[PDB]
Design an enzyme around this catalytic site. Sequence first.
Site, mmCIF file in Angstrom:
data_model
loop_
_atom_site.group_PDB
_atom_site.id
_atom_site.type_symbol
_atom_site.label_atom_id
_atom_site.label_comp_id
_atom_site.label_asym_id
_atom_site.label_seq_id
_atom_site.Cartn_x
_atom_site.Cartn_y
_atom_site.Cartn_z
ATOM 1 N N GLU A 142 6.811 -1.430 3.367
ATOM 2 C CA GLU A 142 7.666 -0.400 2.703
ATOM 3 C C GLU A 142 8.481 0.359 3.748
ATOM 4 O OE1 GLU A 142 4.084 1.554 0.866
ATOM 5 O OE2 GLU A 142 5.358 1.744 -0.924
ATOM 6 N N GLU A 145 -3.186 -5.718 -3.387
ATOM 7 C CA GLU A 145 -1.732 -5.615 -3.152
ATOM 8 C C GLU A 145 -1.490 -5.537 -1.662
ATOM 9 O OE1 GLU A 145 0.035 -2.265 -5.078
ATOM 10 O OE2 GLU A 145 1.616 -1.990 -3.588
#
Length: 212
Positions: free
Chosen positions: A26, A22
Site C-alpha cells: 500500500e 490478505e
Amino acid sequence: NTGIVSSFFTYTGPAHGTQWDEIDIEFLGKDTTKVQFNYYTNGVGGHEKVISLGFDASKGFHTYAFDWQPGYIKWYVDGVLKHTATANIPSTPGKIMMNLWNGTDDWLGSYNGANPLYAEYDWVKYTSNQTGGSFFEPFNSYNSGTWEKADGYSNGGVFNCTWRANNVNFTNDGKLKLGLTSSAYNKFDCAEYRSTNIYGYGLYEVSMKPAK
Ligand SMILES: [Ca+2]
C-alpha cells in the site's frame, strides 16, 4: 488519519466463506517516497513494515512484487528484495485486488477535483507454484472473464468513499486507471478492480504508479 491509499493486495475473508487472509502493498498519498507492506492471517494483522524507496513512487512506474510461499512472504521493489516475513504466514487462496480510496484529513488541503487523483497500473503477473496456474494481464481492456469492477456500495468502516464502476477506466495505451472523484456534498467516489478467480502460493508482480 488514513488519507489517500493506492494498493495491490490478495484477499479472502468471510464474504467468501473463509478466514480473512490478505497480503498487502500500500502507498499512502501523504508520503509516496515510502511503501507499506503488511498481511493478515485469520484476521490478525500488526505486521506493518514501512520501507523507504529512495525515489518518489508517484513519478513513474516501478515493479512491486511479493513471493508468497508456505514459509515466508518476500517483498521486492524493482527486483530487489526489501523485506521478508516468516511469522504466521497466510495460507488461504484469495483474489487479486487493486483499489484507490480515502479514509476518514489533511490530503484535502491540496485536493483539486479538476485534476483528480488516479492510481495507474500497467500490468499484473502471477507465476504460480501450481503448473498451469500462471497468468499475465496487460490491462488493454476490461476482461469480464477474469476481473470485475466494484460498484454501488461502500466498504464502510475506515473507507469513506463509494465504489463506482465508472471510476475504473482503461487508457488507450494500455493502463488501468482508478480514480477518486468528488462533485458535491463532501461525498467521494472511489474504485476497486478485482479478479474473479482465486490464487494461492506464487510470485505476484505489479507495475504501477500510486496516486498523490
Ligand atoms: Ca499495459
